[PDB]
């Protein structure tokens, strides 16, 4: 008897789910198009060459949300800068394979904990892998991942934002529609909603450490891809 989605919420769920699926790499063909990376600055090289298409897919995801498009571009810039690494981390974490103990990046590269860490992320690799491991029993479908992405995208607390309250209103829509979908999905996990909100905090911490470490990683800046530098 917990509330299930309203018609307006079902339309929002369709919109955001479709935006996620259209911009999720090899959605169908990721398990098979996946190749395992063999064996510092050299893994830095394969990880730099793939970051830029990952940022771009996040930009595309945001641009297919009509709520995002009614925001002024300077707010869109702040919002995308705040959430790329959180969304990319989530997108990798839901692609954890317990058998290979790998995450898949860009629907094509399987990396191990050690590879991602030695590769340059440091302790944040442990944070993303441990999120993947704990998301296994969550059984998140495309809709739940899309709604998590929409919730991170629509963060009012981002510094420099103009439409702080318009954004919080958008987020509150996604949060309500997301809880209702969860009530409807009836996962066999106790306190599923409170636990998903803690995963949102886990991703927000990943967002801020990537920021922290980028500061420390400056290694001349022309070595880092342009769009990466834009989204720190």
């Amino acid at each position: 008897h917990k509330p299930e989605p309203t018609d307006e919420e079902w339309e929002l769920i369709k919109t955001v789910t479709e935006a996620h699926v259209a911009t999720n790499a090899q959605g169908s063909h990721w398990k098979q198009k996946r190749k395992f990376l063999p064996e510092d600055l050299e893994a830095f090289s394969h990880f730099t060459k793939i970051i830029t298409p990952a940022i771009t897919r996040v930009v595309d995801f945001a641009k297919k949300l009509p709520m995002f498009c009614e925001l002024p571009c300077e707010d869109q810039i702040i919002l995308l800068k705040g959430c790329c690494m959180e969304i990319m981390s989530l997108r990798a974490a839901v692609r954890y394979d317990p058998e290979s103990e790998t995450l898949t990046l860009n629907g094509e590269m399987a990396v191990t904990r050690g590879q991602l860490k030695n590769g340059g992320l440091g302790v944040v690799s442990d944070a993303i892998f441990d999120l993947g491991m704990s998301l296994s029993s969550f059984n998140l479908d495309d809709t739940e991942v899309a709604l998590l992405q929409a919730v991170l995208l629509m963060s009012s607390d981002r510094p420099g934002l103009a439409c702080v309250e318009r954004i919080e209103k958008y987020q509150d829509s996604f949060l309500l529609a997301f809880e209702h979908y969860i009530n409807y999905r009836k996962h066999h996990v106790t306190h599923f909603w409170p636990k998903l909100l803690m995963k949102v905090t886990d991703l927000r911490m990943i967002g801020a450490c990537h920021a922290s470490r980028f500061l420390h990683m400056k290694c001349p800046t022309e070595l880092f891809p342009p769009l990466f530098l834009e989204v720190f």
């Binding site: 771009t56 930009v59 641009k63 571009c73 869109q76 810039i77 995308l80 800068k81 769009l227 834009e230």
Partner: peptide, 11 residues
């Protein structure tokens, strides 16, 4: 200064 991000947003 967000010039690439700005381009990608306004396309």
């Amino acid at each position: 200064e967000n010039a690439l991000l700005r381009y990608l947003l306004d396309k």
